[PDB]
Design an enzyme around this catalytic site. Sequence first.
Site, PDB file in Angstrom:
ATOM      1  N   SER A  29       2.260 -10.890   3.614  1.00  0.00           N
ATOM      2  CA  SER A  29       4.563 -11.129   3.688  1.00  0.00           C
ATOM      3  C   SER A  29       4.680  -9.928   3.326  1.00  0.00           C
ATOM      4  O   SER A  29       5.992  -9.565   3.702  1.00  0.00           O
ATOM      5  CB  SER A  29       5.031 -11.625   3.206  1.00  0.00           C
ATOM      6  N   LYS A  83       6.579  -7.183   6.365  1.00  0.00           N
ATOM      7  CA  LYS A  83       8.130  -7.293   6.097  1.00  0.00           C
ATOM      8  C   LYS A  83       8.729  -6.500   6.115  1.00  0.00           C
ATOM      9  O   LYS A  83       9.574  -6.102   7.022  1.00  0.00           O
ATOM     10  CB  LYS A  83       8.073  -8.988   6.488  1.00  0.00           C
ATOM     11  N   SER A 103      11.113 -15.016   3.968  1.00  0.00           N
ATOM     12  CA  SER A 103       9.876 -14.869   3.923  1.00  0.00           C
ATOM     13  C   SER A 103       9.199 -15.397   5.572  1.00  0.00           C
ATOM     14  O   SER A 103       8.711 -16.448   5.337  1.00  0.00           O
ATOM     15  CB  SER A 103       8.245 -14.749   3.180  1.00  0.00           C
ATOM     16  N   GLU A 155       2.279 -12.712  12.842  1.00  0.00           N
ATOM     17  CA  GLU A 155       1.889 -14.240  11.949  1.00  0.00           C
ATOM     18  C   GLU A 155       1.452 -14.793  12.947  1.00  0.00           C
ATOM     19  O   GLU A 155       1.817 -15.099  14.463  1.00  0.00           O
ATOM     20  CB  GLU A 155       3.771 -14.446  11.695  1.00  0.00           C
ATOM     21  N   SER A 191       1.652 -13.543   0.195  1.00  0.00           N
ATOM     22  CA  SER A 191       0.598 -14.303  -0.634  1.00  0.00           C
ATOM     23  C   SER A 191      -0.484 -15.139   1.260  1.00  0.00           C
ATOM     24  O   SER A 191       0.275 -15.186   2.518  1.00  0.00           O
ATOM     25  CB  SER A 191       1.074 -15.781  -1.068  1.00  0.00           C
TER      26      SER A 191
HETATM   27  C1  LIG Z   1       3.963 -14.175   3.415  1.00  0.00           C
HETATM   28  O1  LIG Z   1       3.374 -13.413   2.756  1.00  0.00           O
HETATM   29  N1  LIG Z   1       3.593 -15.276   3.525  1.00  0.00           N
HETATM   30  C2  LIG Z   1       5.159 -15.643   4.608  1.00  0.00           C
HETATM   31  C3  LIG Z   1       5.755 -17.160   3.250  1.00  0.00           C
HETATM   32  N2  LIG Z   1       6.314 -16.169   2.379  1.00  0.00           N
HETATM   33  O2  LIG Z   1       5.349 -15.093   1.536  1.00  0.00           O
HETATM   34  S1  LIG Z   1       6.330 -15.399  -0.490  1.00  0.00           S
HETATM   35  O3  LIG Z   1       5.079 -16.842  -0.356  1.00  0.00           O
HETATM   36  O4  LIG Z   1       5.011 -14.419  -0.720  1.00  0.00           O
HETATM   37  O5  LIG Z   1       7.337 -15.638  -0.190  1.00  0.00           O
HETATM   38  C4  LIG Z   1       4.351 -17.335   2.932  1.00  0.00           C
HETATM   39  C5  LIG Z   1       3.204 -17.575   3.191  1.00  0.00           C
HETATM   40  C6  LIG Z   1       2.340 -15.968   3.825  1.00  0.00           C
HETATM   41  C7  LIG Z   1       1.848 -16.383   5.224  1.00  0.00           C
HETATM   42  N3  LIG Z   1       0.496 -16.805   5.385  1.00  0.00           N
HETATM   43  O6  LIG Z   1       2.998 -16.362   6.318  1.00  0.00           O
END
Ligand SMILES: *C(=O)N1C[C@H](NOS(=O)(=O)O)CC[C@H]1C(N)=O
Length: 262
Positions: free
Chosen positions: A44, A47, A104, A140, A211
């Site tokens: 993420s 982004k 996110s 995504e 993550s």
């Molecule tokens: C980004 O890494 N993602 C979107 C979602 N929010 O990220 S955070 O947890 O770092 O705020 C978490 C999952 C991840 C994804 N696999 O889309």
Amino acid sequence: TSAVQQKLAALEKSSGGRLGVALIDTADNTQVLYRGDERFPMCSTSKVMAAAAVLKQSETQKQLLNQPVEIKPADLVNYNPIAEKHVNGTMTLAELSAAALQYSDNTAMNKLIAQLGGPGGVTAFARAIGDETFRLDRTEPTLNTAIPGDPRDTTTPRAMAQTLRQLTLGHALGETQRAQLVTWLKGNTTGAASIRAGLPTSWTVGDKTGSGDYGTTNDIAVIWPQGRAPLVLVTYFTQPQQNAESRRDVLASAARIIAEGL
Ligand SMILES: *C(=O)N1C[C@H](NOS(=O)(=O)O)CC[C@H]1C(N)=O
């Protein structure tokens, strides 16, 4: 190696994974690097760059951020806390940017990517602002597969820190767009367990977490310490097995180690 680097190595060794850190101290432009030129999956944290690329587009379109973007049921992916409320409706590019950065939202991120013509348009923005390392290859949610050795959707800590500095503190964006990006990052809702947990409470942080699979746990931050010029700090972390749990405490520990230096 420096003492900070040896401490980061000890943290990494006890963590069971691979840690990458890049700090830029804009008080003197010095850098602290740990695995600073190794690639890591951004997840993420990519982004930010998509939002900045849309902000860059908005410099020559005053009304771009107010443009509506349709949200269809089929657009929802794996994590859509804001976009699901606008299915069969619309979100503005300003709303999508805020949702991508502060919550996110992966559907919001895919809309930002589409506004740039796909992942290659985000990579092109990176190239245009001097980042030769960043690459966005997928949308995504598959950009989060985070497979070891896979260069797709990766960057290095050094390149990401340099880019985040140019975007938030430099002149990669126009003044208004820079302030908007910083406002968005500072209103992030997801960061309190990551770099933020390792820093003194008095310091202001704007950050973006990420993550993914392989226990990938990322955070990129711009930091305003009390009484000193701002820092840029990038902590990437990834683990050997696909179902590994997130380890945001490792990012906090790395940030805490960084904090003890400058
Ligand atoms: C980004 O890494 N993602 C979107 C979602 N929010 O990220 S955070 O947890 O770092 O705020 C978490 C999952 C991840 C994804 N696999 O889309």
